[PDB]
Amino acid sequence: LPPNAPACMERQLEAARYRSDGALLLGASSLSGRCWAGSLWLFKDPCAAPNEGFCSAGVQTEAGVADLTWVGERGILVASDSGAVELWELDENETLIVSKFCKYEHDDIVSTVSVLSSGTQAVSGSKDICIKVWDLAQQVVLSSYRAHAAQVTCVAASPHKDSVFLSCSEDNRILLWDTRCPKPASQIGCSAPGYLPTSLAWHPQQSEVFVFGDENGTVSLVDTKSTSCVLSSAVHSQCVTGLVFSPHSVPFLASLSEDCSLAVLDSSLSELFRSQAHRDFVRDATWSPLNHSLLTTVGWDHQVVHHVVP
Amino acid sequence: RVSSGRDLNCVPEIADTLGAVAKQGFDFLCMPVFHPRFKREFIQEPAKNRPGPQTRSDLLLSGRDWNTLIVGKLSPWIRPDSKVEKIRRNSEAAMLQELNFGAYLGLPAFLLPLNQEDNTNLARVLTNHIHTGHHSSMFWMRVPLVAPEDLRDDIIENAPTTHTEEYSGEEKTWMWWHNFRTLCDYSKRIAVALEIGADLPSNHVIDRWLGEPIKAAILPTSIFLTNKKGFPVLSKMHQRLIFRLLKLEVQFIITGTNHHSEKEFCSYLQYLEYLSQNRPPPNAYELFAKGYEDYLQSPLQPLMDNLESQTYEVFEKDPIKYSQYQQAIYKCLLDRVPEEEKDTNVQVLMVLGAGRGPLVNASLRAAKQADRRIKLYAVEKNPNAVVTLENWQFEEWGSQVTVVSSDMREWVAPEKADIIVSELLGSFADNELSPECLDGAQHFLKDDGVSIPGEYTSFLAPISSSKLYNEVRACREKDRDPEAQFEMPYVVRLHNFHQLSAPQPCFTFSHPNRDPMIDNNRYCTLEFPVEVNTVLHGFAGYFETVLYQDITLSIRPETHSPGMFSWFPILFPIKQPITVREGQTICVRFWRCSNSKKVWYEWAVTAPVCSAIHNPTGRSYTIGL
Ligand SMILES: O=C(NC[C@H](O)CN1CCc2ccccc2C1)c1cc(NC2COC2)ncn1
Ligand SMILES: Nc1ncnc2c1ncn2[C@@H]1O[C@H](C[C@@H](N)CC[C@H](N)C(=O)O)[C@@H](O)[C@H]1O
């Protein structure tokens, strides 16, 4: 167990992300009991997680971790319960995790963060109904947008365009953003007003295709220019909380749900694989960079599961 | 000082957090009782069987702190009115669970949002909880002045923000509240936590809300401007609303994070304290009226009952009623006896209902001011007060005053009067039966005799108020008609109400009454132009009286005598609230009725819809003769 690393990892695993060199990032929250906090973990040995003794680094955050993402190769950007967005920067030895900035700009829990294509900016989404654009270098809010009418569920930067991102909210709107326009947002999809949208993944190749999951367990594939629902499937029995495309040439889609199961689908949304290895909510999926058939899930059951995918 | 709390949606350690906010100056704290992000499953496995604990422990605070310092918040994910069946069911179960936990803890209040139009299921579940077990807890419905949809930045290229004004649309928020509390049958446990936005809505809204049961006002830090010294303050218009809310006596809740890093948090609060101790101080009236806000007092029997010594004592302190009577007697004397006659002419004055003597003394002071000569009779039917009078007569007044212990309608006067003086008036002028009394007494006034007072007029205005509608509802008793409480007028210091139209005259009486055949019965139709959307809950009653010439008394708000606490307004409720729309006319009809034994009012609303005729036959209320 490394220096400045907590002895105990809070039960509720919120996020799991592989760096390009193969190491695994973990976010966790204490969602019950006396202390309602959170922590950040680095695992250069992916198979060792979630074991606190066999990690490379680790740190306590003041409050819970609602979302996180890698920033480049050493930065870790965090959406906190405290309303703060924070940046933690990895040690040069990569054995300490150190706070870089912690700005209290939202008025309620920050629920979602995404890093923009350039890696110099980021966008956050909150229950305070706002969406915010950050200069990571200068540690400030550049823009604050109140487009929505209910809490913001998810925000996802386009793979390649530094001013384009998707967002979705409990006001039933999926907004396509482009900050070059005087009126930055545009209402999309949901061709007939449907069930609330709960998760978003851009296509990693066709920068104009995305998928969205809804509260009723349906994953749908959208074309931006066509604006008709190209295909959809009832993949889950409950809310779809995350969608993650594989690094593959022909990319597979990992779908995760509050029904506690993981699914994997081809480009036409057909079921290829399904794991009920979890016994509580599945919260993140991350595809191995080193082995494109390995996939890692975390849940509130505190299980870190590694899947093999055809 | 102001009583205030911190809204928080993040609490890592309950003990530390409570301490920080305590130090900053807050009186209480609004916080989740379960972790806001901790979605629970109740039906399908395996998540149904998530090992506990479900939340943190009651042991973390003393019972006393739970009861006094904490307000619970419902979990933001609880959506009883979702379109998805599974979400509805889980939200029901979770809602029950969180409410049961607050009741278990003994929390004094618990916040739930109204943040959309449909809250039918939320209301149903809350109503079910209210009618299960025994607890006193308040429920604060968090509702905004301006709906979130109507506050959004105009930044969606293909969904513009429709800039053309909707008179109705901008009141959608009040209709959310109104539907909700209607489904819940006006439960006295369901109050409003009103959220103020950066852009205040149009004025028209704010007026109504102030008739509603507002227990708290929520101020987000983001609505605060920042001054010369970099401190948080509020716009002139936000100050107005704050001052209204203070007059109402709500609790203030600061929500959101610190948007002025250069200062401590308590700076927001310091500003509220600032505005508070910067109100105009209590005027003479408001000092005496201070404990009486919206307190209903049931009808008095002026003839059949006798006033208590302490009742006379409190009213004898009126700073204006007596000096106004002194002046009226002063003017009348001068006019009745010219200068050359100032010693040949001794005027006969009769105080009819002399109580413990203040109008006898006022009479004497009026003569020793006009330099004229008077003989006084003091008539009083309350034999207990007659005790005070007769001791006054022996120790002080001497033979100038003749105390008579009887009813003025019964007394055989030894001689006729130049002037009869009386103060027999109720809040609705004639509801202590001043007419009947002076009618029966007038036979002993001289043919050119003056009556002080000379006349009085009653006034009515329609009003809106859930708080008062509930107060009345709560006056149901065993062993009488279950709706009798709605069929009688109450004297009340109306406070949490909205006046829907300007007062209009109702009944008028003149004294003496040289009507060939005297008839005190009355029927009057009133038409009240209303210019907001609202709910009619009853009619405020007021009066005005001419004592003599320009010397008057009034509780009509427009012409209210200064400092005169002696009469509060009266309230005539209606059995059923009636919806009124902007532009509509309220038509009410009042009758004064009587027989040889008693006098009563009956009333009915006939536009925009009819009510039941109230109090037919005097079945629920009469005043005995
Ligand atoms: O309007 C009220 N009662 C209706 C009665 O006709 C008032 N008159 C007023 C003059 C008077 C004088 C002597 C004896 C009795 C009375 C009763 C009322 C006002 C109030 N004022 C508070 C006492 O301190 C302010 N409290 C409770 N009731
Ligand atoms: N019909 C009546 N005959 C004689 N006394 C009456 C009659 N009706 C009411 N009173 C008395 O008139 C008084 C009315 C009071 N509001 C006035 C009290 C006193 N004059 C004062 O102004 O302080 C009460 O003390 C009643 O008991």
PDB file of C-alpha atoms in Angstrom, chain A residues 11-12 14 29-37 62-66 81-83 104-109 127 129 144-151 171 173 175 177 182-188 195 215-216 237-239 258-260 278-281 300, chain B residues 9-14 31-41 44-47 50-57 60 76-77 79 82-84 86-87 90 115 148-149 151-161 220-222 255-259:
ATOM      1  CA  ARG A  11     -17.709   0.196  -1.764  1.00  0.00           C
ATOM      2  CA  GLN A  12     -19.384   1.947  -4.717  1.00  0.00           C
ATOM      3  CA  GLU A  14     -18.312   4.623 -10.221  1.00  0.00           C
ATOM      4  CA  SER A  29     -17.682   6.756  -3.801  1.00  0.00           C
ATOM      5  CA  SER A  30     -18.987   6.075  -0.326  1.00  0.00           C
ATOM      6  CA  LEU A  31     -22.731   6.244  -0.978  1.00  0.00           C
ATOM      7  CA  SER A  32     -23.792   4.952   2.432  1.00  0.00           C
ATOM      8  CA  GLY A  33     -22.463   4.751   6.022  1.00  0.00           C
ATOM      9  CA  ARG A  34     -20.940   7.536   8.109  1.00  0.00           C
ATOM     10  CA  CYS A  35     -18.631   9.245   5.602  1.00  0.00           C
ATOM     11  CA  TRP A  36     -19.868  10.147   2.137  1.00  0.00           C
ATOM     12  CA  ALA A  37     -16.638  10.682   0.287  1.00  0.00           C
ATOM     13  CA  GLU A  62     -13.345  15.393  -0.149  1.00  0.00           C
ATOM     14  CA  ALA A  63     -16.694  14.220  -1.618  1.00  0.00           C
ATOM     15  CA  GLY A  64     -17.980  11.422  -3.842  1.00  0.00           C
ATOM     16  CA  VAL A  65     -16.968  10.868  -7.427  1.00  0.00           C
ATOM     17  CA  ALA A  66     -19.946  11.167  -9.741  1.00  0.00           C
ATOM     18  CA  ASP A  81     -20.802  15.799  -5.390  1.00  0.00           C
ATOM     19  CA  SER A  82     -19.528  19.094  -3.916  1.00  0.00           C
ATOM     20  CA  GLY A  83     -20.450  20.959  -7.124  1.00  0.00           C
ATOM     21  CA  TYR A 104     -16.589  25.226  -6.952  1.00  0.00           C
ATOM     22  CA  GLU A 105     -18.581  26.569  -9.895  1.00  0.00           C
ATOM     23  CA  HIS A 106     -21.729  24.409 -10.029  1.00  0.00           C
ATOM     24  CA  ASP A 107     -24.577  24.855  -7.538  1.00  0.00           C
ATOM     25  CA  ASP A 108     -25.456  21.170  -7.201  1.00  0.00           C
ATOM     26  CA  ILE A 109     -23.734  17.807  -7.765  1.00  0.00           C
ATOM     27  CA  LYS A 127     -28.016  18.769 -11.547  1.00  0.00           C
ATOM     28  CA  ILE A 129     -29.182  22.332 -14.970  1.00  0.00           C
ATOM     29  CA  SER A 144     -21.730  28.696 -18.927  1.00  0.00           C
ATOM     30  CA  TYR A 145     -24.870  27.467 -20.756  1.00  0.00           C
ATOM     31  CA  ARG A 146     -28.376  27.123 -19.325  1.00  0.00           C
ATOM     32  CA  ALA A 147     -29.924  25.376 -22.329  1.00  0.00           C
ATOM     33  CA  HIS A 148     -31.750  22.678 -20.382  1.00  0.00           C
ATOM     34  CA  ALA A 149     -34.838  22.744 -18.127  1.00  0.00           C
ATOM     35  CA  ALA A 150     -33.989  19.779 -15.869  1.00  0.00           C
ATOM     36  CA  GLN A 151     -30.828  18.156 -14.475  1.00  0.00           C
ATOM     37  CA  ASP A 171     -36.167  17.576 -19.897  1.00  0.00           C
ATOM     38  CA  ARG A 173     -33.782  16.977 -24.902  1.00  0.00           C
ATOM     39  CA  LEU A 175     -28.711  18.713 -27.694  1.00  0.00           C
ATOM     40  CA  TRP A 177     -23.705  21.661 -29.542  1.00  0.00           C
ATOM     41  CA  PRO A 182     -24.315  32.329 -31.971  1.00  0.00           C
ATOM     42  CA  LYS A 183     -27.085  30.023 -30.693  1.00  0.00           C
ATOM     43  CA  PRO A 184     -24.739  27.065 -29.764  1.00  0.00           C
ATOM     44  CA  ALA A 185     -27.239  24.228 -29.310  1.00  0.00           C
ATOM     45  CA  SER A 186     -29.732  22.381 -31.456  1.00  0.00           C
ATOM     46  CA  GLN A 187     -32.461  19.908 -30.437  1.00  0.00           C
ATOM     47  CA  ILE A 188     -32.007  16.477 -32.080  1.00  0.00           C
ATOM     48  CA  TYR A 195     -38.410   8.033 -22.997  1.00  0.00           C
ATOM     49  CA  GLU A 215     -34.476   5.161 -19.214  1.00  0.00           C
ATOM     50  CA  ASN A 216     -36.548   2.295 -20.598  1.00  0.00           C
ATOM     51  CA  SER A 237     -34.862  -4.227 -18.761  1.00  0.00           C
ATOM     52  CA  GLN A 238     -33.872  -1.005 -16.970  1.00  0.00           C
ATOM     53  CA  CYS A 239     -32.135   2.331 -17.489  1.00  0.00           C
ATOM     54  CA  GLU A 258     -29.150  -0.740 -13.775  1.00  0.00           C
ATOM     55  CA  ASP A 259     -30.541  -4.221 -14.486  1.00  0.00           C
ATOM     56  CA  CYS A 260     -27.022  -5.261 -13.396  1.00  0.00           C
ATOM     57  CA  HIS A 278     -22.509  -8.272 -11.448  1.00  0.00           C
ATOM     58  CA  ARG A 279     -25.024  -8.392  -8.625  1.00  0.00           C
ATOM     59  CA  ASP A 280     -25.459  -4.606  -8.322  1.00  0.00           C
ATOM     60  CA  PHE A 281     -25.554  -1.714 -10.847  1.00  0.00           C
ATOM     61  CA  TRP A 300     -21.617  -1.133  -6.912  1.00  0.00           C
TER      62      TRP A 300
ATOM     63  CA  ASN B   9     -26.910  18.625  -1.584  1.00  0.00           C
ATOM     64  CA  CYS B  10     -23.500  17.312  -0.428  1.00  0.00           C
ATOM     65  CA  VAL B  11     -22.590  16.190   3.143  1.00  0.00           C
ATOM     66  CA  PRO B  12     -19.410  14.068   3.561  1.00  0.00           C
ATOM     67  CA  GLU B  13     -19.472  14.163   7.355  1.00  0.00           C
ATOM     68  CA  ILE B  14     -22.682  15.178   9.084  1.00  0.00           C
ATOM     69  CA  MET B  31     -29.693  18.104   3.562  1.00  0.00           C
ATOM     70  CA  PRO B  32     -30.295  14.645   2.075  1.00  0.00           C
ATOM     71  CA  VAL B  33     -31.143  11.831   4.509  1.00  0.00           C
ATOM     72  CA  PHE B  34     -30.003   9.248   1.988  1.00  0.00           C
ATOM     73  CA  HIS B  35     -27.114   9.897  -0.474  1.00  0.00           C
ATOM     74  CA  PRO B  36     -28.617  11.815  -3.425  1.00  0.00           C
ATOM     75  CA  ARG B  37     -26.949   9.479  -5.974  1.00  0.00           C
ATOM     76  CA  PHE B  38     -27.750   6.249  -4.120  1.00  0.00           C
ATOM     77  CA  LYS B  39     -30.547   4.849  -6.351  1.00  0.00           C
ATOM     78  CA  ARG B  40     -32.190   1.881  -4.598  1.00  0.00           C
ATOM     79  CA  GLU B  41     -34.003  -1.113  -6.098  1.00  0.00           C
ATOM     80  CA  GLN B  44     -36.007  -7.174  -9.080  1.00  0.00           C
ATOM     81  CA  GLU B  45     -32.923  -9.112  -8.035  1.00  0.00           C
ATOM     82  CA  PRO B  46     -30.077  -8.902  -7.516  1.00  0.00           C
ATOM     83  CA  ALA B  47     -29.948  -5.145  -6.745  1.00  0.00           C
ATOM     84  CA  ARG B  50     -27.867  -4.828  -1.977  1.00  0.00           C
ATOM     85  CA  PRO B  51     -26.246  -5.301   1.448  1.00  0.00           C
ATOM     86  CA  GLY B  52     -26.929  -2.333   3.771  1.00  0.00           C
ATOM     87  CA  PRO B  53     -26.672   0.008   5.582  1.00  0.00           C
ATOM     88  CA  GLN B  54     -29.191   1.924   3.443  1.00  0.00           C
ATOM     89  CA  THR B  55     -27.994   5.267   4.866  1.00  0.00           C
ATOM     90  CA  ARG B  56     -26.100   6.738   7.815  1.00  0.00           C
ATOM     91  CA  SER B  57     -27.044   6.356  11.444  1.00  0.00           C
ATOM     92  CA  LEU B  60     -24.606  10.663  14.573  1.00  0.00           C
ATOM     93  CA  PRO B  76     -33.606  13.960  -6.706  1.00  0.00           C
ATOM     94  CA  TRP B  77     -33.964  10.642  -8.533  1.00  0.00           C
ATOM     95  CA  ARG B  79     -39.855  10.348  -9.699  1.00  0.00           C
ATOM     96  CA  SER B  82     -42.434   9.131 -14.381  1.00  0.00           C
ATOM     97  CA  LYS B  83     -43.910   7.557 -17.528  1.00  0.00           C
ATOM     98  CA  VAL B  84     -41.883   4.407 -16.954  1.00  0.00           C
ATOM     99  CA  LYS B  86     -40.684   0.454 -13.027  1.00  0.00           C
ATOM    100  CA  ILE B  87     -39.410   3.902 -12.136  1.00  0.00           C
ATOM    101  CA  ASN B  90     -39.394   2.234  -7.177  1.00  0.00           C
ATOM    102  CA  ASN B 115     -40.755  20.999 -10.806  1.00  0.00           C
ATOM    103  CA  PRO B 148     -37.085  26.223 -15.321  1.00  0.00           C
ATOM    104  CA  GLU B 149     -38.302  25.954 -18.967  1.00  0.00           C
ATOM    105  CA  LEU B 151     -35.833  30.675 -17.491  1.00  0.00           C
ATOM    106  CA  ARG B 152     -33.647  28.811 -19.987  1.00  0.00           C
ATOM    107  CA  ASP B 153     -31.092  30.801 -22.009  1.00  0.00           C
ATOM    108  CA  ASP B 154     -32.300  31.542 -25.529  1.00  0.00           C
ATOM    109  CA  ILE B 155     -29.568  29.379 -27.070  1.00  0.00           C
ATOM    110  CA  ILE B 156     -31.325  26.578 -28.956  1.00  0.00           C
ATOM    111  CA  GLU B 157     -31.208  27.629 -32.613  1.00  0.00           C
ATOM    112  CA  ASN B 158     -34.184  25.396 -33.626  1.00  0.00           C
ATOM    113  CA  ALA B 159     -36.258  25.806 -30.425  1.00  0.00           C
ATOM    114  CA  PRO B 160     -36.694  29.559 -29.851  1.00  0.00           C
ATOM    115  CA  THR B 161     -37.923  30.945 -26.518  1.00  0.00           C
ATOM    116  CA  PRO B 220     -29.735  30.990  -4.654  1.00  0.00           C
ATOM    117  CA  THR B 221     -26.368  32.705  -4.298  1.00  0.00           C
ATOM    118  CA  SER B 222     -26.384  33.270  -8.058  1.00  0.00           C
ATOM    119  CA  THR B 255     -28.850  27.524  -1.684  1.00  0.00           C
ATOM    120  CA  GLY B 256     -25.895  27.006  -4.092  1.00  0.00           C
ATOM    121  CA  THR B 257     -22.124  27.643  -3.683  1.00  0.00           C
ATOM    122  CA  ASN B 258     -20.151  30.789  -2.819  1.00  0.00           C
ATOM    123  CA  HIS B 259     -19.960  33.057  -5.875  1.00  0.00           C
TER     124      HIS B 259
END
